[PDB]
Structure formats: structure tokens, C-alpha cells
């Protein structure tokens, strides 16, 4: 062994120890929101079916407790998605809101304690809102 | 040659022979599970299609033996993924379970002999479970 | 200067001239295959899109000659990767094969003149094969 | 099979024995017929825990132990 090889190796080590690293948080922050809505959107179909068939609101709940000719139970647990929690509460007058609240022990720091919501007016119009940042909100709701 | 250069080279060799090395097993242990579910999830689409079209269960199998107007064969071999083996067995009553068992001759030591499963209730609800550690289980199932 | 220092230096030189060197060929032989498949896998998406949209096979080629409403040209040159050459030839009946042939003037000696292939059956099943050694074949194909 | 003989280095002998559970230890034992008197019959070792942590130890004197292990 000589000093030339060792010095060249030391120099190449320092050269390699210079690669830059860009940001990688917005990607996950957007992927979380792209999944939350994709998971909590289909419930509108069951809500509309239950409201148009004949049964009134309130009885519409979540979980996995079978179904009957009076109450409706969509086949998803309130904590099926480990990213957050889902909550539904349809009033007797048809108006209601299905909300998804991000959990702090699973979701990302930016999307922590944030809430998305889909509301149904009394006449029968579906709107949606969220509390996340503008760049992280999906391309289907406001803020 | 002198003793100064040789001693400096020997000292620099010992200095370089001190770089620490962190852990690198959890990465592969999690990547294996992230691929297992991603590979064995899409079969639910074919299962639901076969159960809703008209054909009964049981006949639903795996492999590559073409298809007809009675039996269904999803286009994947039982050992397509070298990490483990897939097994499906839908009962005549619709209830069934698609399982993925990790092999010992390919999978990692931690994820060896572990089994993931996706079950379909009689009424028509999809659940999933696994036997891996909590930190290695994907963010879509329990333990 | 004395003889003690010179003899000690000569002895330390011989001592240092005894470091062993392990093998380092399998690493590159496996890295080449890990890159070949990673580069030539995504073409299946474009193949399936072109076969399901409406246009027939044959017209599907490679290079960079723009696109139109009849022919498809995936944005990669036949020699984009300097490790080998890519070749696609989809038949009119949908069946085809995308192959990657390693070049002798760039690839390693072990992975020289070897060929990987991804075939599409007539019914619509994707299989893959290779001609490399068992230990160098990726964990997604046979031999 | 790593491409090195168990006695490639004439200063000592190498020994590896990885258990089925992943835990193992790679050791280097200095020989008396080649190594120096001070570094005679001494053993260096690199151990791998079950979870996956690499540690190293030696039995040489403090001043002779390299700057990457304990004693």
C-alpha cells in the first residue's frame, strides 16, 4: 500500500459524499389525501340508495353488523383505513355529512388533525370541503 | 520510503476502519409485505365478478388453463411470485379466503412461514388479517 | 539512518501487503439484471393500452417518431440503455414478445449474449423467461 | 462461498459460523507461528445480533486495539 491510493480513495469518498437530496414530503401529503377521498366517496351511493328506497335517516350507520329491511350498515369499519377515522350521521330530514378525520398516530405531520367532509343539503345537493392546505387538497373540493 | 509516510498511512487506515453501519433488515421486511399485498389484492375483483355473474364458487381456481363459460381461471400461477405461494378456495356459499404463505427458501427470515389472508363473509364483507409483526404489517390490515 | 528503522519499514510493508480481496463479480452480474427488467418492464402498460384501445398489433414499434391516431411509438430508443438492445414485435393476433438482448461491448462477461423475454399469450396472459444463470436471474422469472 | 481461504492472511485464521436465526460471529484468531509476540493468541470478533445490529470486540491491549472497537 502507498499514500497515492489512500489519498485518491479519501478524495473519491468526499466527492461521492456530495449528492443532493430534494424534498419528499409533499408527495406523501398528497397521496394521503388522494386515498382518503377515494376511500370515503363511495358511501354517497349507499346514502342515496337508503334515502330514496324508503327508510329514514339516523338508522344509517357504519360497521359490520349485517343488514335487514329497516336499518342499513355499509360494509366498512369506522377505522378500516389506518390513516384516519370515518363518521356518518344522517339527520331525519335527509340532510347529513360524512366526515373523515385524520389521526395523529398514523397520518403525516402536515395532514394531522385535518378533516374532510361531504355534506348533503336538504333539497338534495352534494358538496364537499376540507381543512388541508391548498396544494394538498384534491382536485374536487375547496378549502 | 520513510517511517513517517508508512505510519501516517497505517493511522489513516485505522481511521477509515471506523465507519458505523446501521440496521437494514426492517427495510426488506417491510418491502416484502408491501409487495405481497400489492400482488394478491387484485384477485378480489375477479372473485366478485365470478360471484356476481352467475357461476358458483369452488370452480374458481388459479393457474393458466384458459377460460370458458362455466369455470374461471385468473391468469396467475400459484407460484408466480417467488416470495411465497398463493391459495384460493371459494366455498359454494360464496364465503372464502385468499391466502398468501411466505416461503422459507426465498422470503426473509423474519417474514418466514408467515401468512396473510383476505376473507369474504357470507353476507358479502371483505376483511383481511396477517400473522407478521406489528411494525411489518401493511397499513391496511390488523394482526 | 540506521538498519533497524529500514528493516522495520520493510517488515511493515510486507505485513500490509497481505490484505485479502473477496469476489466482486456477482454483484455487477446481478445489478445488470436488476436494471434490465426494471427498464424493459413498463412497456407492458403501453402494449396493453394499444391492444385494448382499438388499434391492432404490428404497428406498435419503438423509437421517437411522435404518435398519431393509428400507430403507437413508445418514447424509448432501441438502444436507450447502453447495456443491451430492446426489441418488440406484436403480432396481429395480439400475441407477442418484448425481448432484451445483452450486448458484448458493454455488458459484463457473464451476462454477455444473454436474452430476457416477456411473452403475451393469445388469450391474454403475461409470462417471462430468461437465459441467465439461476443465481443471476431476478426474483420474478424462471430460467 | 466468499472468495477467501480460511488462511489467506498468513497473520492468522478466519472463522465464520452464521446460525439459522441470522445471528452469528466472524472471528479472526492470530497465529503464534506468524503474528508478533504481543498479538499472539489474540482474537478479534464481529457479532451480529438477532434483530440486526453489528458489534465488534477484541482481546488485544487498549493501545493496540483499532479505533473502531472496544476491549
Swiss-Prot record, chains A, B, C:
Q: List the cysteine pairs that form cystine.
A: 128-141
* Membrane-spanning segments: 1-21
Where in the sequence is N-methylphenylalanine found? 1
Q: How is it modified after translation?
A: Methylated by prepilin peptidase PilD at the amino group of the N-terminal phenylalanine once the leader sequence is cleaved.
Family statement drawn from the similarity comment of this UniProt entry: Belongs to the N-Me-Phe pilin family.
Q: Which PANTHER family match?
A: GENERAL SECRETION PATHWAY PROTEIN G (PTHR30093), PREPILIN PEPTIDASE-DEPENDENT PROTEIN D (PTHR30093:SF34)
Q: What is this protein called?
A: Type IV major pilin protein PilA
Organism placement in taxonomy: Bacteria, Pseudomonadati, Pseudomonadota, Gammaproteobacteria, Pseudomonadales
What gene, per UniProt, encodes this protein? pilA
Amino acid at each position: 500500500f502507498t499514500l497515492i491510493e489512500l489519498m485518491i480513495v479519501v478524495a473519491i469518498i468526499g466527492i461521492l459524499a456530495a449528492i443532493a437530496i430534494p424534498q419528499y414530503q409533499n408527495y406523501v401529503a398528497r397521496s394521503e389525501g388522494a386515498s382518503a377521498l377515494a376511500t370515503i366517496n363511495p358511501l354517497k351511493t349507499t346514502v342515496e340508495e337508503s334515502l330514496s328506497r324508503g327508510i329514514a335517516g339516523s338508522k344509517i350507520k357504519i360497521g359490520t353488523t349485517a343488514s335487514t329491511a329497516t336499518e342499513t350498515y355499509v360494509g366498512v369499519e369506522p377505522d378500516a383505513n389506518k390513516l384516519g377515522v370515518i363518521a356518518v350521521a344522517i339527520e331525519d330530514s335527509g340532510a347529513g355529512d360524512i366526515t373523515f378525520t385524520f389521526q395523529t398516530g398514523t397520518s403525516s405531520p402536515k395532514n394531522a388533525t385535518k378533516v374532510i367532509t361531504l355534506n348533503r343539503t336538504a333539497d338534495g345537493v352534494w358538496a364537499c370541503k376540507s381543512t388541508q392546505d391548498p396544494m394538498f387538497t384534491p382536485k374536487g373540493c375547496d378549502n
